Amino acid sequence: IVDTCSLASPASVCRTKHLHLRCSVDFTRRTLTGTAALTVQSQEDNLRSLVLDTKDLTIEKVVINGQEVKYALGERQSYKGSPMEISLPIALSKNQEIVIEISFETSPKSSALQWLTPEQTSGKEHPYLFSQCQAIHCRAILPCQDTPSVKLTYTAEVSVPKELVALMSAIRDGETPDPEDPSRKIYKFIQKVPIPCYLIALVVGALESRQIGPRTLVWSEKEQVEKSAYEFSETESMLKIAEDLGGPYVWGQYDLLVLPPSFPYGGMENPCLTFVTPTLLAGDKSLSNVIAHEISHSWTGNLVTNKTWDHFWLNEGHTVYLERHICGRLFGEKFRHFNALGGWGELQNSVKTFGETHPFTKLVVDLTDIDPNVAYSSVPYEKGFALLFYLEQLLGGPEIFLGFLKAYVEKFSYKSITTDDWKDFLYSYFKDKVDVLNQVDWNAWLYSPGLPPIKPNYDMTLTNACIALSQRWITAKEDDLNSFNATDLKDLSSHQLNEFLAQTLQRAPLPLGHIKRMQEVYNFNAINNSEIRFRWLRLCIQSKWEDAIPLALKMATEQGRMKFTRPLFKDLAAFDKSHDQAVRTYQEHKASMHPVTAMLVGKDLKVD
Ligand SMILES: CCCCC/C=C\C\C=C/C=C/C=C/[C@@H]1O[C@H]1CCCC(=O)O
Ligand SMILES: [Yb+3]
Ligand SMILES: [Yb+3]
Ligand SMILES: [Zn+2]
């Protein structure tokens, strides 16, 4: 097992045990400067050098035993960055530990960071910075073994302009004036649980907080605090359910940070401080499954970790499985099945986009010379979930399979594992059902592209009305459109409206007159729920309604969640009437987008 996405020495050669980060955030230069002190343990005899990952980092010096040591930056290897070899002053024996202090500065173009001007924030008076290290962007902040096969503790001291606040994926450990610059404050942090370095995270900005549970504050700019406190009020109830299913919550605090609209994901499971998109702020808590998902990562992902990114499905599939159990406990088993069946539809969509033979539709994926951001899709989420849901039904039901899940978390806590470790423990836990496990087509499920070889069984109770109404619209002729009316929606929840739109979008385009009628009688243009609005606008653009062009351009640019922004830009580029404007709009906005999102939209549009 080799991590083909890292250029650093592997864990079999040496292991980082601890990071002590002292840095300063310079908004004038858009740089982070400081020192990263790595406590490294040799795993072999006579160790005289080691290699760290870096990406667009300027290295000033490397200090061991109080003296500068020799180092060399190799040539850049595309998205992987540049390897940094350090010559150790004294050969190390196996299990010997030393401290290596590296003085470094980031580049303004760091792919881990987005620097925001005051005008890009809610308050309009202060700048803002946030990080996103998953999968392999931590090396664009600091030199490290940038592989999830290594887990380390960390402490940090971050100097910032005194008007602003710093937060990290760690427990807050005090603040003080910066003695080297009275215009600044130093914020301190401690992460005492070993983590993979992709879970290191930093935000700096004009942040305020409100308590919403016994172990949860929500953080945001002042303009969003009140709405966020209401939107995420289910958090503590979800944590209690998650603890019941996964075992103890070991991280102390579970805080939430609501980022500015360019944050690229629904959430990011940064330990002690989950990051979330403001597109969750629907006003009715209806997108709270994203919080259940990030909560669940506190066990599946953050405690039990994928050893390499080839095995990412271990993180995401088990987390989606726990996510849907949390929402099933809250709202019922029929709702769990409804969301499960919706996820199968999303798997169908991903497979249909990539193509049924595409290597990125395999559950286990070989990322040799593949940028993980390019490979990312809903496949590991939903093919992984589908495998676990299938096994649940094969092995005796959800109560039995949740017993496996808790035992799995306990077995591999604080470790990094592969698909074969998972499968071996599955066969160990279910030793009395090995004959049943040997009926599984393991090669198809784990290593073949396309849809899985067997579809699970799904309760249809909550889905039937969505399918029925979608089919009424698809089979309607012009003389049937008069029969549709706002009353068609009166018994549908927001989740069901979203699924009605998903069902109909799968058959797009529809005739333009149908889409116009849908707006006339359902007024979907008025809905601000981001998931509903996204699917409605995709349906309008794919059905060639020119009126929807400005709406789709607005949504694609006024937020930056990649799930929404990328498909909206792609749909607009595919519609001949909006193509030129889509490209011009991307070019005008690209410099102020998140660096990774800008790169991907450019690839999607075939723009340079
Ligand atoms: C199995 C294919 C391997 C390729 C992917 C490898 C590494 C993934 C890189 C970045 C992942 C960021 C994930 C963020 C949170 O779980 C996502 C919840 C929000 C997603 C959304 O709803 O927009
Ligand atoms: Yb030796
Ligand atoms: Yb303390
Ligand atoms: Zn996730």
Curated annotation (Swiss-Prot):
Changing residue 132 to A/L: Srongly increased epoxide hydrolase activity. Its cofactor is Zn(2+). Bifunctional zinc metalloenzyme that comprises both epoxide hydrolase (EH) and aminopeptidase activities. Acts as an epoxide hydrolase to catalyze the conversion of LTA4 to the pro-inflammatory mediator leukotriene B4 (LTB4). Also has aminopeptidase activity, with high affinity for N-terminal arginines of various synthetic tripeptides. The active site is at residues 294, 381. It catalyses: leukotriene A4 + H2O = leukotriene B4; (5S,6S)-epoxy-(18R)-hydroxy-(7E,9E,11Z,14Z,16E)-eicosapentaenoate + H2O = resolvin E1; (5S,6S)-epoxy-(18S)-hydroxy-(7E,9E,11Z,14Z,16E)-eicosapentaenoate + H2O = 18S-resolvin E1; Release of the N-terminal residue from a tripeptide. The modification N6-acetyllysine is found at residues 70, 334, 411, 570. Its EC number is 3.3.2.6, 3.4.11.4. It holds the Pfam family Peptidase_M1_N. The modification Phosphoserine is found at residue 413. InterPro entries: Aminopeptidase_N-like_N, Aminopeptidase_N-like_N_sf, ARM-type_fold, LTA4H, LTA4H_cat, M1_LTA-4_hydro/amino_C_sf, M1_LTA4H, Peptidase_M1. One of its GO terms (molecular function) is leukotriene-A4 hydrolase activity. Binds 1 zinc ion per subunit. Changing residue 369 to N: No loss of activity. This is Leukotriene A-4 hydrolase.
